[PDB]
Amino acid sequence: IVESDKPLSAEYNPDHPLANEEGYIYKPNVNVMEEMANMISASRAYQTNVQVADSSKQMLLRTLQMGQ
């Protein structure tokens, strides 16, 4: 697992306990749009590999029945 190299989104929360000398606090660089695409892409990619395995499972069965 490799973390994204995007800079952390700095927010001005000067009264926050964790604020730095300039009153900035940093928050994760997670972008909603790309994480939603990953949710869609991973799920659709997961389900199509089940289809291949299920189809490949049938082909092995028909080979067993070959000749009889």
């Binding site: 697992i1 009264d15 926050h16 306990p17 964790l18 994760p28 909603v32 994480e35 939603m36 949710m39 869609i40 799920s43 997961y46 389900q47 089940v50 395995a53 299920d54 499972k57 069965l61």
Partner: protein, 248 residues
């Protein structure tokens, strides 16, 4: 089934908890001497064998907004507000000393000086302040000194009887207890009576809840809550699809 259902469920549950924390601040906008509670999220990774891909998020209360509240001018002698930073020492019904910021004082039939919530206010002797029963004019000093006038006494009899115990400790060492009284995180720690804090007599300090700050937190908590719910839905959708493998 995939453990991502519970990973997203644990985030959705915590977003509700942070929502309730912000809800208490909005329910307490008009409360006297009320310090708004801060809410944030902490990332705690699930260390163990395997790829480091599962990290939980749980909400916490890192601190409180110790800014000065909105001062209300009431023109009442027994109403005081702390100027700048400070606290008032009071003991609750359990006789446990705790710091408060509610300066809406009152005098009972026995003469003991209490606040709006009934907590006895401490003084120089570190004992609850008791005033002579038949008073005629009560004036609270700017530094906390209490000067009273006996009933029928002439004007030149403004003798002081007590001094309000004002405490100004570090705001990061105080936690809000179960009854709204801030106490030291380290137990059995004495409260030193500071002589620098001042009272703006004739006014009441309101709450420091930033209504916009809570509203913008709400809308972000809603969206993050809804996105994790979609993660729960797509987790069971994948699980249902990956069930025809054993469907020979």
């Amino acid at each position: 089934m995939d453990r991502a259902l519970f990973l997203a469920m644990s985030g959705a549950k915590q977003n509700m908890q942070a929502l309730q924390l912000r809800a208490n601040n909005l329910a307490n906008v008009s409360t006297t001497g009320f310090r708004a509670d801060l809410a944030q999220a902490r990332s705690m990774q699930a260390y163990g064998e395997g790829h480091p891909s599962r990290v939980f998020s749980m909400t916490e209360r890192p601190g409180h907004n110790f800014a000065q509240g909105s001062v209300i001018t009431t023109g009442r002698d027994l109403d005081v507000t702390i100027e700048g930073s400070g606290w008032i020492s009071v003991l609750d019904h359990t006789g446990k000393e705790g710091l408060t910021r509610n300066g809406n004082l009152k005098v009972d039939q026995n003469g003991m000086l209490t606040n709006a919530s009934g907590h006895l206010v401490l003084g120089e002797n570190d004992a609850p302040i008791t005033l002579p029963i038949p008073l005629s004019k009560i004036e609270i000093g700017r530094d906390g000194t209490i000067s009273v006038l006996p009933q029928g006494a002439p004007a030149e009899e403004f003798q002081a009887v007590d001094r309000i115990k004002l405490v100004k400790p570090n705001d990061q060492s105080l936690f809000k207890d179960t009854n709204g009284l801030f106490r030291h995180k380290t137990p059995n720690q004495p409260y030193e009576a500071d002589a620098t804090v001042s009272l703006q007599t004739g006014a009441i300090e309101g709450s420091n809840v930033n209504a916009v700050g809570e509203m913008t937190a709400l809308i972000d908590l809603q969206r993050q809550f809804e996105m994790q719910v979609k993660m729960m839905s797509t987790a069971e959708e994948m699980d249902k699809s990956s069930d025809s493998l054993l469907r020979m």
